[PDB]
């Protein structure tokens with residue numbers, strides 16, 4: 001069992017939970033690949049295993065309904081080639097997928113998740129109304145609440161439910177008279193899929209893209225989001241009066257709409273989940289990545305920093321203030337947000353809870369460590385073990 | 401072969417060099433352990449030696465020549481007769497350079513060709529060992545214009561014990577346990593400090609007392625050796641605009657010289673081969689001064705900066721650490737002591753990966769060690785996927801000799 005040390009304190013644990021791993025990862029004894037981003041009847045074995053998880057979690061191994069529920073899935077597959085999850089199981093499976101996500105630093109919250117069941121969804125027009133319920137529920141006038149909406153489980157020989165945008169809220173990416181991009185360059189492609197399918201393109205750096213929702217074996221359909229429902233936060237700095245004039249904004253709800261939820265062998269290619277932001281996601285990655293909004297130099301000129309030499313650490317000063325402006329703005333607007341120090345400190349608490357309950361925790365070091373001030377947070381000093389448990393959120397190819 | 405993406409540009413390469421990794425690391429297909437600090441007969445000596453010699457004769461563009469099979473047969477016959485063999489001097493120099501080249505946790509490998517190799521394999525005692533080490537420090541420091549060097553002491557051989565430098569670096573500050581429970585000085589060095597005192601060193605009681613060296617000759621107890629103060633170049637720390645910063649009384653030394661690692665070349669083992677370069681400012685500013693278990697000055701600096709420390713979202717920790725780094729850089733520049741900031745170092749590491757892709761089809765790299773401990777995604781290495789693996793020649797960790 002892997003020895004795991006915390007170098008701040010000196011304490012040692014052993015990950016016994018690693019023993020239960022399922023889908024082999026990308027690493028071999030020859031070379032480590034942990035820094036890479038995107039590295040019939042067998043349906044029964046994963047179903048048995050998930051049901052066993054459910055019942056031991058509610059202290060129900062060696063019991064009647066446990067014995068009993070094993071047969072129904074047995075019978076359901078035999079008769080139909082698949083099965084339906086009991087509503088409580090879909091609830092328990094969604095939380096466990098969240099809990100097992102190695103790249104999520106906010107899993108201290110995993111037990112509080114609202115599960116919208118859209119398994120009887122029927123059309124793209126129906127998807128949109130579920131999506132719109134979710135958003136308004138999750139947003140909650142800025143007091144954000146974790147939530148996932150679960151669309152029907154994919155079935156053999158018949159189409160898929162899929163959301164085409166990577167998130168429920170994404171800003172446009174327009175290409176210009178010189179090839180380059182006005183707006184968010186992360187979404188250049190889906191902006192061009194949208195302009196294609198009827199959308200009248202704007203000219204702004206912060207235009208909420210229209211959704212593309214896909215009924216099975218039908219082409220995607222454009223849906224505009226009602227602007228009253230897309231809560232957004234204008235960015236301003238508590239003491240840098242000019243920062244507001246840069247016209248920067250970000251949206252309130254982080255809602256990932258391109259990952260595939262897998263519970264007990266069943267695959268849900270449409271299952272958007274949402275929480276609230278950690279401030280470095282907006283202030284550091286989305287605003288300061290060279291291939292995202294790349295605002296770093298503009299803020300530095302405004303601060304009258306010396307940008308002629310790297311050793312003035314003007315990049316570091318400008319980045320810290322951009323993060324300050326994000327935190328201050330969301331707090332002033334009363335939108336739930338958490339800083340990287342509070343977030344990582346809560347995750348160290350999660351790791352400890354998980355050690356007592358399950359004997360370990362799959363964590364991906366490069367993703368848990370924040371992208372500014374790494375070693376100032378306690379996770380930097382924490383050794384971690386990465387591996388795959390089910391149920392899980394998985395990546396999936398693009399439906400085109 | 402593993403596909404490697406740069407997420408800032410879109411570039412894509414394939415690490416073919418990884419195929420040739422002829423030792424195992426800690427990960428399996430079940431689980432990745434890449435974030436752990438310390439994961440870990442003539443036939444095998446021969447095949448390591450054979451492979452290194454092939455490397456050497458490739459580097460001199462004489463692969464498959466008279467000299468080449470000459471040396472191979474020669475090395476086997478020397479193993480057959482003696483159970484080991486000796487490196488020629490130019491083989492030693494190529495072997496130390498490749499070891500630096502192959503080191504996955506080193507961000508400064510752009511410089512890997514520029515290395516001064518001191519051959520101390522004739523060294524015969526701890527006293528001579530000390531004289532060689534003083535000469536290393538003198539040459540490498542070069543009055544502040546630092547030069548990369550390594551001194552190689554006699555290899556491990558059967559029948560005799562190893563030379564060892566008990567100290568983890570040639571320059572280290574003492575760490576004394578206080579009246580209460582606190583450490584005065586550097587808490588990373590409580591153990592080596594206790595060993596020196598137990599071996600008769602007379603301790604000080606400052607926060608920056610340079611430690612003596614504990615030098616072990618084969619089959620010999622370690623011997624204490626004081627470093628002449630004018631040999632250890634130090635830098636008082638001041639901040640260019642925060643004039644109260646100088647009153648903290650903080651110092652760091654110029655020369656980073658790791659002295660406890662094992663150099664392995666062609667199957668042969670050199671347990672004493674100290675190497676030195678020059679510092680990247682985050683090692684001092686962020687890690688050494690701001691780690692909670694090191695000097696731990698962050699809160700004190702932030703209170704002095706009049707930052708609001710009662711709440712994390714004011715980002716006082718981040719603000720105060722950026723200024724401690726500014727101070728480190730400005731102080732070394734003022735003092736005319738070589739130093740590189742994490743923006744310049746990561747930028748030149750990106751050229752190294754480029755040069756190495758062309759030369760060898762890859763480059764072993766430990767992402768979590770290459771990405772600096774502040775401003776990670778502000779540097780380009782954050783956005784570069786990397787493949788960690790073990791190539792020989794190599795610097796390797798070894799157990800403490802006590």
Ligand code: HEM
Nearest residue numbers: 098101103104105106109146148273274275276277278393
């Ligand atoms: C409630 C507050 C939450 C916070 C502060 C949080 C924080 C984060 C952060 C910072 C990331 C890194 C994403 C990136 O860098 O692109 C992440 C990833 C992730 N989160 Fe969370 N999260 C929260 C809730 C949730 C919920 C409710 C779910 C699912 C039900 C979830 C599932 C995931 C998954 C699957 C990833 C991996 C994303 C990927 O691989 O691209 N998180 N989280």
Ligand code: HEM
Nearest residue numbers: 500503505506507508511548549675676677678679680795
């Ligand atoms: C000349 C400028 C150099 C720079 C800027 C540099 C930079 C660095 C840095 C920042 C680290 C991480 C240290 C830590 O976090 O503890 C490192 C590690 C390392 N470097 Fe370099 N280095 C230089 C020269 C050298 C030389 C001359 C050698 C050997 C010939 C070398 C071999 C290594 C090794 C073996 C490690 C890993 C040590 C460990 O894992 O504890 N470096 N380097």
Ligand SMILES: C[C@H](O)[C@H](O)[C@H]1CNc2nc(N)[nH]c(=O)c2N1
Nearest residue numbers: 035036366367407782783784785
């Ligand atoms: C190449 C590297 O693995 C990649 O840029 C990763 C590093 N760590 C990350 N961590 C998080 N949370 N999100 C990311 O997008 C990344 N990017």
Ligand SMILES: C[C@H](O)[C@H](O)[C@H]1CNc2nc(N)[nH]c(=O)c2N1
Nearest residue numbers: 380381382383435436437768769
């Ligand atoms: C646990 C974790 O791996 C550990 O704190 C590592 C992280 N990355 C590092 N990177 C460097 N360069 N130096 C270090 O000491 C560490 N420490």
Ligand SMILES: CNCC#Cc1cc(C)cc(N)n1
Nearest residue numbers: 254256273274275276277278
């Ligand atoms: C490309 N990753 C975007 C993202 C994200 C994300 C998702 C959730 C649920 C919370 C959070 N804080 N962030």
Ligand SMILES: CNCC#Cc1cc(C)cc(N)n1
Nearest residue numbers: 656658675676677678679680
């Ligand atoms: C715990 N490793 C300490 C270290 C180090 C180091 C070593 C060298 C040669 C250069 C450098 N810049 N840093």
Ligand SMILES: [Cl-]
Nearest residue numbers: 254281282286
């Ligand atoms: Cl985002």
Ligand SMILES: [Cl-]
Nearest residue numbers: 656683684688
């Ligand atoms: Cl150091």
Ligand SMILES: [Gd]
Nearest residue numbers: 301302303304
């Ligand atoms: Gd001005």
Ligand SMILES: [Gd]
Nearest residue numbers: 640641642643
């Ligand atoms: Gd001043």
Ligand SMILES: [Zn+2]
Nearest residue numbers: 027032427432
């Ligand atoms: Zn790995």
